């Protein structure tokens, strides 16, 4: 079957877009080379509809069956529940996309009536009717990146298909408890939504140190959500029909399943019928532990067809990278091109064809690579890093035009003991929250596709948990990582790092006469800019906070929603 079919009818915007870089005195003081950053819009929507548009046929072995079979039985060890609407309700972001039945994300926040009511009404007809197509609208995502002269200049939007809010609460009610536990049942170690940033560096770490000789690759298919069939996603029913739900939560699954998550009419903006879907849907609660439990099997099942050796994976969603013990350089070559091809008839053919890696820090996992510095007595710590130049560029952007939902926040939570954020991306807040005087105010951001809600004001608290005191403290950066630092802010237009030295003492010393937590950041965030180091102690908020299963509560999912817990 063809991934989708379509009318001819646009897929069209809500609110205006623009697609280049405003130039402005703050965004510029970050970055000068304005029209190498866009974003992209409908413009570009048909360019990405061809693209995700094709044909899927699928021959599944006894590899396949065998794998599937044993994730099943793995499965059965789980016991879920139904969320309770509140439960739901309050898993909601505040900017959800509105309810067409009059109501949007802030009345399904506060429990109002007429949002509570339709969604009742939304959740007793799946328990009645297992069949009729759920409507979804599809949307042009506005994402930002800079130019890549290199790979055919801009990237076309991508494409976002999702049902009504009432829909949406109802998934979590069904599903959400689901997200929470199924994943490391079936997986195990293997699942990555589970793990801050600096778990997921000891997971690789030990992956490569216990191979003899250790050989990784990066498995990319193209268009994965378009490679995922009707068969695949009522293969995902059957896997989470096998754990011990109650009745009702199995009604209200498989209806979800038959009139949303296998297919449906898709509509635009303005309510004109714009396809069919046949394929994942990107914009469902299960899109993300869809992903990686059918990613995992495919992988698994081709490890076996191709012979590779002692397989260690790391997945999330469609991000797939596999360890194994080498077999050679040409039998390892040989052997990622026959894991290609079983992959292949699994339905899931590469993009860029998976090469054969033999250095750790090249082992990239969600655009992410492990990095290693010196911490403050001069042991080693490694963590996690990635290219800045996306960062960068969204940073820019999101200075000049507020973003409800940002990027930078968390990346610099993500990032935080990295060079790139420290110098760069914490001196450029700090100094704009001052600027605009709102320091201490609650921020949405996105970290590792859901929503979550800081203080910046908590920072120092929060990036000492997740990643310990030496991210105050972490020095001797690596040539690999300060060279890929230093061309992206040449290739940006972007002041270099000893400019940002010199900023960050300025924005350190406004900080620390403030007082109060505002002092705070000063001292432990800017401590590497100044000459007589302070000693930075344990923060007392730190042990207060449980992050501890922060990353896990996210499910990779969408629209799911956390604050910080206290």
């Known amino acids: 079957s063809m991934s989708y079919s379509w009318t001819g009818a646009l897929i069209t915007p809500c609110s205006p877009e623009e697609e280049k870089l405003p130039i402005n005195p703050l965004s510029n003081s970050l970055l000068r080379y304005h029209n190498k ?21 699928q021959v599944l072995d006894a590899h396949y069956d065998s794998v599937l079979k044993d994730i099943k039985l793995a499965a ?13 309700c309050q898993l909601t972001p505040p900017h959800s996309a509105r309810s067409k039945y009059g109501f949007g994300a802030k009345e399904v926040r506060s429990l109002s009536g007429r949002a509570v009511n339709h969604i009742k009404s939304v959740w007793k007809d799946l328990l009645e009717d297992p069949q009729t197509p759920i409507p979804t609208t599809i949307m042009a995502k506005n994402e930002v990146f800079c130019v890549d002269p290199a790979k055919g200049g801009k990237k076309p939007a991508r494409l976002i298909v999702y049902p009504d809010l009432g829909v949406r609460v109802c ?32 997971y690789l770490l030990k992956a490569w140190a216990e191979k003899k000789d250790p050989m ?7 268009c994965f959500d378009s490679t995922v069939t009707e068969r695949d996603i009522r293969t995902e029913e059957s896997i989470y029909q096998a754990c011990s739900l109650p009745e009702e939560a199995r009604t209200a699954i498989h209806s979800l399943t038959e009139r949303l998550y296998v297919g449906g009419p898709m509509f635009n903006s303005k309510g004109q ?25 495919k992988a698994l ?25 080498s077999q050679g350089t040409e039998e390892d070559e040989r052997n990622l091109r026959a894991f290609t091809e079983a992959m292949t008839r699994y339905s899931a053919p590469p993009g860029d064809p998976p090469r ?61 003991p990295t060079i790139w954020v420290r110098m760069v991306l914490m001196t450029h807040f700090f100094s704009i929250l001052m600027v605009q005087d709102t320091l201490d105010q609650n921020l949405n951001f996105e970290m590792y596709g859901s929503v979550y809600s800081v203080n910046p004001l908590d920072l120092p608290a929060i990036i000492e948990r997740l990643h310990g005191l030496d991210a105050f403290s972490m020095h001797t950066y690596s040539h690999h990582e300060l060279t890929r630092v230093a061309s992206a802010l040449r290739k940006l237009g972007a002041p270099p790092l000893r400019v940002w030295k010199s900023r960050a003492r300025a924005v350190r010393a406004s900080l ?30 730190a042990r207060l906070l449980d992050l501890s299963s922060w990353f896990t509560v996210g499910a990779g999912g969408g629209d799911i929603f956390h604050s910080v817990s206290v």
């Open 356 to 416: 054969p890696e033999y250095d750790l820090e090249l082992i990239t996992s969600c655009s992410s690579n492990v990095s290693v510095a010196l911490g403050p007595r001069g042991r080693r710590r490694y963590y996690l890093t990635r290219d800045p130049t996306t960062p960068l560029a969204r940073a820019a952007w999101e200075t000049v035009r507020h973003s409800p939902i940002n990027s930078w926040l968390g990346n610099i939570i993500q990032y935080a």
């Open 216 to 222: 990784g690759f990066s498995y990319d298919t193209r």
């Open 76 to 88: 059965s060890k789980v016991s879920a529940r139904l969320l309770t609407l509140e439960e739901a």
């Open 171 to 202: 998934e979590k009610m069904a599903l959400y408890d689901i997200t929470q536990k199924l994943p490391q049942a079936v997986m195990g170690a293997s699942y990555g939504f589970q793990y801050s940033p600096a778990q997921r560096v000891e």
């Open 512 to 541: 620390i006469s403030r007082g109060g937590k505002a002092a705070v950041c000063g001292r432990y965030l800017f401590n590497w800019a100044v000459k007589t180091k302070l000693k930075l102690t344990p923060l007392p908020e």
């Open 273 to 297: 019928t714009c396809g069919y879907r046949r394929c994942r849907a990107s914009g469902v609660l299960t899109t993300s532990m869809g992903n990686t439990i059918t990613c995992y099997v």
């Open 37 to 57: 950053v866009y974003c992209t819009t409908s413009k570009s929507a048909s360019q990405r509809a061809k693209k995700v548009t094709f044909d899927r046929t």
């Open 301 to 325: 099942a081709a490890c076996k067809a191709a012979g590779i050796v002692a397989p260690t994976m790391l997945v999330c969603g469609d991000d797939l990278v596999v360890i194994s013990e």
